[PDB]
């Protein structure tokens, strides 16, 4: 299907957007985000509507849609 675009909001209000398919495992997003922030992936927690995003969660499992937000906090 189509990519949806998710906005990842940092603790400093910066944003990096990610295009993922509905079946993509979100570990891939977490790794890319941590790489771009220059920190270990395991130093961060990623939340969707306040709930923890697992490595093998997909947008379909979480009910995500175009322009949904992910918030990143320290682990």
């Amino acid at each position: 299907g189509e990519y949806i675009k998710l906005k990842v909001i940092g603790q400093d209000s910066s944003e990096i957007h990610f295009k993922v398919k509905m079946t993509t495992h979100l570990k891939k997003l977490k790794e890319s985000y941590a790489q771009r922030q220059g920190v270990p992936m395991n130093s961060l927690r990623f939340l969707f509507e306040g709930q923890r995003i697992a490595d093998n969660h997909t947008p379909k499992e979480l009910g995500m849609e175009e322009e949904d937000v992910i918030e990143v906090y320290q682990e």
């Binding site: 990519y3 675009k5 910066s14 944003e15 990096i16 957007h17 990610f18 295009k19 993922v20 398919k21 993509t24 891939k28 997003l29 890319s32 771009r36």
Partner: peptide
């Protein structure tokens, strides 16, 4: 002002 950042999340030939 930050610019927009959009990231796309997308063996017989081996020799080692």
């Amino acid at each position: 002002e930050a610019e927009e950042r959009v990231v796309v999340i997308s063996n017989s030939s081996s020799r080692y």
